[PDB]
């Protein structure tokens, strides 16, 4: 029931917590609503849902950038690096965020405006062959009982990654990630009373296998959507 004194890490944790909540609404503090564009059977692509989903995707990527600039030291990196980090982590954070909006008993996921889609609608909106992979991840997350604090730190840790190809100052990025890992660890300790640190980090590796496929889902969607892929989505997954 005792913990050492860690003032500075506690401030960082708080800043990242706020940065997260403020750039990503809580499921409970959200006015969920339903649609039905094609909740009955899975189809190649429900254009009506894609239009909505793609609009929500554009906005959430915007918020992620907003979240990135709120991370201590992020803006201190070079512009090229910031862009590099964002492009490499965007999808990972997107998956993590949507899966945090999972309502297991109704098997749905809620978007930032409240739109709540079920598994079939998620598929028809554009996830296609990823639907199951993402839902499984959402389910494997429930036992961890992560809060916005942990989600923000985990997202921050995923973003600020020195092992990204093309970084001009990797060691500078590595220096920013250290406090984050330690803050996540320290935090897990006071909260969860006691082997969750490695367990939660291991989830980053699960995210990579899913984001790996998401890159190929973009190519596929390009050939099936009416116009062109929303520009911001193109910059982040090209």
């Amino acid at each position: 029931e005792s913990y050492e004194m860690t003032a500075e890490l506690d401030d960082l944790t708080e800043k990242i917590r706020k940065a997260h909540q403020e750039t990503f609404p809580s499921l409970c503090q959200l006015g969920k609503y339903t649609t039905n564009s094609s909740a009955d059977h899975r189809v190649r692509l429900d254009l009506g849902l894609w239009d909505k989903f793609s609009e929500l995707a554009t906005k959430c990527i915007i918020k992620i950038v907003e979240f990135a600039k709120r991370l201590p030291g992020f803006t201190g990196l070079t512009i090229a690096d910031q862009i590099t980090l964002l492009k490499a982590a965007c999808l990972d954070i997107l998956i993590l965020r949507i899966c945090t909006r999972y309502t297991p008993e109704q098997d749905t996921m809620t978007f930032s405006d409240g739109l709540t889609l079920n598994r079939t609608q998620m598929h028809n909106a554009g996830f296609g062959p990823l639907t199951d992979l993402v839902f499984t991840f959402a389910n494997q997350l429930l036992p961890l009982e992560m809060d916005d604090t942990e989600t923000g730190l985990l997202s921050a840790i995923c973003l600020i990654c020195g092992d990204r190809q093309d970084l001009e100052e990797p060691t500078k990025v590595d220096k920013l990630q250290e406090p984050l890992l330690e803050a996540l660890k320290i935090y897990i300790r006071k909260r969860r009373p006691p082997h969750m640190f490695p367990k939660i980090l291991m989830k980053i590796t699960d995210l990579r296998s899913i984001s790996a496929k998401g890159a190929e889902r973009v190519i596929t969607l390009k050939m099936e959507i009416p116009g062109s892929m929303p520009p911001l989505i193109q910059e982040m997954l090209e």
């Binding site: 915007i62 803006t75 512009i79 910031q82 862009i83 492009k87």
Partner: peptide
């Protein structure tokens, strides 16, 4: 670029 503007 959109990223540049948003980051600038």
């Amino acid at each position: 670029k959109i990223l540049h503007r948003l980051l600038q």
